[PDB]
Amino acid sequence: SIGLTVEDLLSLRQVVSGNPEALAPLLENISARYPQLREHIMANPEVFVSMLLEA
Amino acid sequence: SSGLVPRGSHMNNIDFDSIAKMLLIKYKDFILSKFKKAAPVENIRFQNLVHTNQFAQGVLGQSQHLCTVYDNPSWHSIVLETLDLDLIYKNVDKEFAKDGHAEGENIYTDYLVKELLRYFKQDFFKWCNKPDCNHCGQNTSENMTPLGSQGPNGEESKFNCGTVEIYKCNRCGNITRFPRYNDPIKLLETRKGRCGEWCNLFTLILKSFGLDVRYVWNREDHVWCEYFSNFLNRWVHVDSCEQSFDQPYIYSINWNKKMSYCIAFGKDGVVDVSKRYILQNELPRDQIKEEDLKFLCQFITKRLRYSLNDDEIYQLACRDEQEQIELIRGKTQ
Numbered sequence: 208s209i210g211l212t213v214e215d216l217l218s219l220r221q222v223v224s225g226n227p228e229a230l231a232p233l234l235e236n237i238s239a240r241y242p243q244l245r246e247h248i249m250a251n252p253e254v255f256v257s258m259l260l261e262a
Numbered sequence: 263s264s265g266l267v268p269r270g271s272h273m274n275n276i277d278f279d280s281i282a283k284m285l286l287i288k289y290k291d292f293i294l295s296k297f298k299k300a301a302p303v304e305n306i307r308f309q310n311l312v313h314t315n316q317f318a319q320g321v322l323g324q325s326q327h328l329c330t331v332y333d334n335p336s337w338h339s340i341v342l343e344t345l346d347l348d349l350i351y352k353n354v355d356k357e358f359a360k361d362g363h364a365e366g367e368n369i370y371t372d373y374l375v376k377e378l379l380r381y382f383k384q385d386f387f388k389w390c391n392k393p394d395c396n397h398c399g400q401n402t403s404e405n406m407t408p409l410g411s412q413g414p415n416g417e418e419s420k421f422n423c424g425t426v427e428i429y430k431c432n433r434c435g436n437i438t439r440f441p442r443y444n445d446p447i448k449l450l451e452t453r454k455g456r457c458g459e460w461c462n463l464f465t466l467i468l469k470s471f472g473l474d475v476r477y478v479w480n481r482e483d484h485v486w487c488e489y490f491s492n493f494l495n496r497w498v499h500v501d502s503c504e505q506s507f508d509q510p511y512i513y514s515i516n517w518n519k520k521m522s523y524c525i526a527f528g529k530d531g532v533v534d535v536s537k538r539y540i541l542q543n544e545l546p547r548d549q550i551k552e553e554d555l556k557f558l559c560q561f562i563t564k565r566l567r568y569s570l571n572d573d574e575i576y577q578l579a580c581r582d583e584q585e586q587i588e589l590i591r592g593k594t595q
């Protein structure tokens with residue numbers, strides 16, 4: 208792991224620094240579209256956060 | 263009843279709001295870490311890259327001349343004394359009158375910038391290809407033939423001047439000279455010049471209303487401004503010469519200029535703003551490993567902020583990031 212699209216990595220950076228209100232629903236939408244990250248979220252969100260801090 | 267296993271009501275309803283609020287926390291540590299130290303590792307990378315490459319030394323040099331320099335109370339005041347604030351603020355107020363958006367939400371600031379452009383161009387400062395003849399009339403330049411360039415005399419040496427273009431008047435024989443100053447306070451007096459000094463003074467002017475301002479440098483010989491519009495909360499392209507407000511395409515498309523790089527400079531950082539401007543007739547960027555340029559800016563921006571505090575370091579870093587996405591993508595928002 209981990210791999211999400213460049214387009215998402217963008218709109219993630221976009222909000223986690225610019226509209227943090229929408230960070231929750233964007234994370235909704237990512238586990239929505241990425242199965243294997245719906246698993247990482249639950250199985251341990253604290254790793255999933257620090258993996259995420261890699262783009 | 264049980265053990266049958268109770269169901270609850272719904273499963274692992276996975277808490278995003280939790281994990282969202284968490285992260286924003288983690289991020290901030292990531293950011294505050296980034297803008298730290300200057301661990302001597304990347305220091306050589308820097309000290310060194312500035313010797314691999316002159317496009318590097320070029321940006322480094324400019325950073326030094328251009329980032330701190332316009333933050334100067336003494337200056338800011340003089341400019342304010344000197345400008346006709348009554349007039350500026352009247353017109354700005356007159357245009358706010360004819361409603362200034364539903365949300366006048368720092369829009370005033372934009373109307374000010376725009377009106378400063380107008381004052382500067384219609385009224386304050388004047389363009390100079392060859393100069394007028396000092397002894398013959400005013401409207402009188404196209405009977406000056408130029409005898410080259412040379413160092414400043416004693417007087418004009420004061421005003422940070424390198425070259426004085428000298429010119430002979432064929433109709434009278436006297437020699438008008440055109441010193442090329444960098445002291446923008448001098449320009450307030452002479453009120454004339456070319457992109458160059460036009461831009462020097464206009465940056466300072468913007469800075470003297472306490473706006474957040476930048477000097478944009480195109481390697482293919484033009485210079486202009488970027489101003490931060492809290493109402494559009496992004497950077498806005500300001501070019502005084504063309505009395506232009508939000509028109510970054512101007513160069514690339516209207517003029518059909520070919521460009522390679524564009525760099526911004528300001529108290530808060532140095533940033534590659536090419537992507538805002540170079541939107542066709544792109545020239546080869548063949549001056550510096552793109553990786554190294556990124557680094558170069560980042561290291562200077564980082565250096566430019568040791569004495570800021572954690573709240574400042576972060577709020578700035580986000581603005582920067584908001585920018586990247588604006589440039590990386592094709593649009594605002």
Ligand SMILES: *[C@@H]1O[C@H](CO)[C@@H](O[C@@H]2O[C@H](CO)[C@@H](O)[C@H](O)[C@H]2NC(C)=O)[C@H](O)[C@H]1NC(C)=O
Nearest residue numbers: 456457482483484485501502503504516517519
């Ligand atoms: C030097 O700066 C000046 C000021 O903007 C530029 O003069 C513009 O030139 C373009 C190119 O055709 C014209 O569209 C404008 O009409 C000119 N401005 C005016 C009203 O004089 C000039 O282009 C700049 N030099 C460059 C391109 O480096």
Ligand SMILES: [Zn+2]
Nearest residue numbers: 395398431434
């Ligand atoms: Zn003359």
